[PDB]
Design a protein around this nucleic acid. Structure first.
Ligand SMILES: [Mg+2]
Ligand SMILES: [Mg+2]
Ligand SMILES: [Mg+2]
Ligand SMILES: [Mg+2]
Ligand SMILES: [Mg+2]
Ligand SMILES: [Mg+2]
Ligand SMILES: [Mg+2]
Ligand SMILES: [Mg+2]
Ligand SMILES: [Mg+2]
Ligand SMILES: [Mg+2]
Ligand SMILES: [Mg+2]
Ligand SMILES: [Mg+2]
Ligand SMILES: [Mg+2]
Ligand SMILES: [Mg+2]
Ligand SMILES: [Mg+2]
Ligand SMILES: [Mg+2]
Ligand SMILES: [Mg+2]
Ligand SMILES: [Mg+2]
Ligand SMILES: [Mg+2]
Ligand SMILES: [Mg+2]
Ligand SMILES: [Mg+2]
Ligand SMILES: [Mg+2]
Ligand SMILES: [Mg+2]
Ligand SMILES: [Mg+2]
Ligand SMILES: [Mg+2]
Ligand SMILES: [Mg+2]
Ligand SMILES: [Mg+2]
Ligand SMILES: [Mg+2]
Ligand SMILES: [Mg+2]
Ligand SMILES: [Mg+2]
Ligand SMILES: [Mg+2]
Ligand SMILES: [Mg+2]
Ligand SMILES: [Mg+2]
Ligand SMILES: [Mg+2]
Ligand SMILES: [Mg+2]
Ligand SMILES: [Mg+2]
Ligand SMILES: [Mg+2]
Ligand SMILES: [Mg+2]
Ligand SMILES: [Mg+2]
Ligand SMILES: [Mg+2]
Ligand SMILES: [Mg+2]
Ligand SMILES: [Mg+2]
Ligand SMILES: [Mg+2]
Ligand SMILES: [Mg+2]
Ligand SMILES: [Mg+2]
Ligand SMILES: [Mg+2]
Ligand SMILES: [Mg+2]
Ligand SMILES: [Mg+2]
Lengths: 48, 109, 136, 63, 48, 63
RNA sequence: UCUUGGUGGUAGUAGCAAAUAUUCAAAUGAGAACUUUGAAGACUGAAGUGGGGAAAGGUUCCACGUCAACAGCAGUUGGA
RNA sequence: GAUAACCGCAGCAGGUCUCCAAGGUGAACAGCCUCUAGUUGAUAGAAUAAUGUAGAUAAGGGAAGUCGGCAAAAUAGAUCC
RNA sequence: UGUACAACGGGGUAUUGUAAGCAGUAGAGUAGCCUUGUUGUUACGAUCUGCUGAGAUUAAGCCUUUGUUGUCUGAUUUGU
């Protein structure tokens, strides 16, 4: 916890996220979900 | 356990020679194959076939293959065996591709 | 930076140290601008004062009208070409470095800007936005 | 939070990703990565680059 | 665990980017619940 | 053993270099008894020393 | 800053890093990174790390035996 | 006849006169790769801190560095203008 | 002797940019066959098209794993 009570207007700001990035950090990711990846790329050769 | 056994393994030499000096990739492939065979057979004395040495050195000093299929047989050391009475001797296996192959026990029949 | 600009500016990445020759984007007659100074610049040993988009610089005219050359006049950097970040996450840049000749309170010497103008510059300087066409 | 389009490759640009380029004649080119940025700088045609959306639409892949 | 990035609206009156979207790096700390196993008593002494 | 003298003698007998002289590794004991050029000649006849054919420099790509 | 001889500390230390590069087996041996042979990999690339000579050296050539010293690691090898 | 047989205190990256001279690229006895022939000798093994030596790359600016563009980069062959 | 760990294998993620092979009524054309087509033939032919966002690589300091095969008592020292 904060050791002092901060009233600096950068604190006391109620944050609401609009979006969280979930693309791959193991490269330059392009897709947020595998469903998005499948919708962009269509169907590949990989076995069903 | 049971002493003499012949198995086939695939060694990933790509991950074992990642970042190695170019004039040392094939000597360190020889030494990683010995390290691999000591890990899998429990034998400090590993002998490598010169066919395996040709297979390692096939594309020169820095062109070691990413994957070798090795037959390693653990054997009985004869004519005044050393601190370990077993030795492990490593052959190459002539395969079309060294990918998608699991470890298999070669039976002696 | 200094006096004349209307508003604060977020920190844009510095692209233009002193000695940089940037294009002259107005129709004052000058073809380029040699940056000799940056307004509102901190004191640090060995650091070249470096201009950024929307900054007021002091500049000389190397190529241009004989009435414009051999003088120190204020200019305002309108195009950067060093890639800078906006707080909305965008990293952006132009092809060229460009600026417009201005007076010490930021009224423009020319009256028309060729090419685009950075939005940070147009919000910092109202006469630059007045004489600018497309902005980013 | 407007998802943009790669100008070279047609990939989707989420916020913070890639680079924006204002060409000197004031046309905006958005790139999802430095691959698209570099092949734009190299004057490559997207119609001849086999993995781009504009290649695949012209060569009629994936319908 | 590592970082990701977010988009959120800004509630900062007087900022130029008031009520617009900003992209912010965030660190994700993976926090499973802690198990309480002990208690320790501490007396104040002239040595601490 | 030490077959250095036999490889030098075998090169001089068959008329090639020492890089082109093959000695039988399984017949080292009776190679080592060949201290004379006549004995080297006899091992060349019985195939214990082999002329070890030339390394090819093909001119097909040149042609 | 004596002379000659001997010995320390520094100190098992500085170093033994130019000339692309070695590796597997067998043999020999008490003992093999270094010897021999096979195998593979490389290099000099014909103004050569090849084949000969001039000066100089003087037996270094070659074989057999052999490793105390010498080959600034080793040595079963050697211009020892 | 020399990165060990010569001189340099030595088996020293120095120095020391000459002959012969394959294929390809290419103007070329350049550089690069190969054939014949020769060698694979130079203490090794493990790890990959700082600082080095040698080799590099670098956004935006482009000599603002420094006594001085020192070092590096840029240019490069050929054909036509 | 484990909801173990390892080595392989599988999947995901990622990078590159469409592998080899086969086929083609694609190919600037040139050279042969004529019982001369008219989307005849034979030889050579950069490249192109389909199978093919394929193939390759992927932890070496990426993620995951109900798969296969292994491994799991060597040594030394310590007492108020
Ligand atoms: Mg990452
Ligand atoms: Mg295996
Ligand atoms: Mg590395
Ligand atoms: Mg090499
Ligand atoms: Mg299998
Ligand atoms: Mg200061
Ligand atoms: Mg003047
Ligand atoms: Mg004779
Ligand atoms: Mg004295
Ligand atoms: Mg004295
Ligand atoms: Mg002493
Ligand atoms: Mg010592
Ligand atoms: Mg030392
Ligand atoms: Mg040194
Ligand atoms: Mg060296
Ligand atoms: Mg041996
Ligand atoms: Mg060694
Ligand atoms: Mg080999
Ligand atoms: Mg070479
Ligand atoms: Mg001799
Ligand atoms: Mg001896
Ligand atoms: Mg010695
Ligand atoms: Mg000794
Ligand atoms: Mg020796
Ligand atoms: Mg000797
Ligand atoms: Mg001599
Ligand atoms: Mg001297
Ligand atoms: Mg010398
Ligand atoms: Mg000498
Ligand atoms: Mg040449
Ligand atoms: Mg040759
Ligand atoms: Mg050395
Ligand atoms: Mg730079
Ligand atoms: Mg640049
Ligand atoms: Mg310039
Ligand atoms: Mg100047
Ligand atoms: Mg100066
Ligand atoms: Mg100065
Ligand atoms: Mg001067
Ligand atoms: Mg100098
Ligand atoms: Mg210079
Ligand atoms: Mg000309
Ligand atoms: Mg394709
Ligand atoms: Mg490919
Ligand atoms: Mg193909
Ligand atoms: Mg793979
Ligand atoms: Mg994992
Ligand atoms: Mg099992």
């Amino acid at each position: 916890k904060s050791l002092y009570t901060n009233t600096s207007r950068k604190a006391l700001e109620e944050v609401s996220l609009k979006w969280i990035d979930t693309a791959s950090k193991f490269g330059k990711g392009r897709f947020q979900t595998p469903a998005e990846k499948h919708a962009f790329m269509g169907t590949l050769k990989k076995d069903l | 356990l049971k002493d003499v056994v012949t198995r086939e393994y695939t060694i990933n030499l790509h991950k074992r020679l990642h970042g190695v000096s170019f004039k040392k990739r094939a000597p360190r492939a020889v030494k990683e194959i010995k390290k691999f065979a000591k890990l899998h057979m429990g034998t400090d004395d590993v002998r490598l076939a010169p066919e395996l040495n040709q297979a390692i050195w096939k594309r020169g000093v820095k062109g070691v293959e990413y994957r070798l299929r090795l037959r390693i047989s653990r054997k009985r050391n004869e004519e005044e065996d050393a601190k370990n009475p077993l030795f492990s001797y490593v052959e190459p296996v002539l395969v079309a591709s060294a990918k998608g192959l699991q470890t298999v026990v070669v039976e002696e029949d | 930076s200094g006096n004349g600009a209307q508003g604060t500016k977020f920190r844009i990445s510095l692209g233009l140290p002193v000695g940089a020759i940037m294009n002259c984007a107005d129709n004052s007659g000058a073809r380029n601008l040699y940056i000799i100074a940056v307004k509102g610049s901190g004191s640090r040993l060995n650091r070249l004062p470096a201009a950024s988009l929307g900054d007021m610089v002091m500049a000389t005219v190397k190529k241009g009208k004989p009435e414009l050359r051999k003088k120190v006049m204020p200019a305002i950097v309108v195009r950067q070409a060093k890639s800078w970040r906006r707080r909305d996450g965008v990293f952006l840049y132009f092809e060229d470095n460009a600026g417009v000749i201005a007076n010490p309170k930021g009224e423009m010497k020319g009256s028309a800007i060729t090419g685009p103008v950075g939005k940070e510059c147009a919000d910092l300087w109202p006469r630059v936005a007045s004489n600018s066409g497309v902005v980013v | 939070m407007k998802v943009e389009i790669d100008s070279f490759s047609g990939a989707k640009i989420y916020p913070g990703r890639g680079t924006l380029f204002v060409r000197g004649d004031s046309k905006i080119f958005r790139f999802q990565n430095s691959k698209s940025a570099s092949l734009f700088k190299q004057r490559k045609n997207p119609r001849r680059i086999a993995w781009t959306v504009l290649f695949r639409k012209h060569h009629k892949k994936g319908i | 665990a590592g970082m990701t990035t977010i988009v959120r609206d800004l509630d900062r009156p007087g900022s130029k980017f008031h009520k617009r979207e900003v992209v912010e790096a965030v660190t994700v700390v993976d926090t499973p619940p802690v198990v309480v196993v002990g208690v320790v008593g501490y007396v104040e002494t002239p040595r601490g | 053993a030490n077959l250095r003298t036999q490889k030098r003698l075998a090169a001089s007998v068959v008329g090639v270099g020492k890089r082109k002289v093959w000695l039988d590794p399984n017949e080292t004991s009776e190679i080592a008894q060949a201290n004379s050029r006549n004995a080297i000649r006899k091992l060349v006849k019985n195939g214990t020393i082999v002329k070890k054919a030339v390394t090819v420099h093909s001119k097909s790509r040149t042609r």
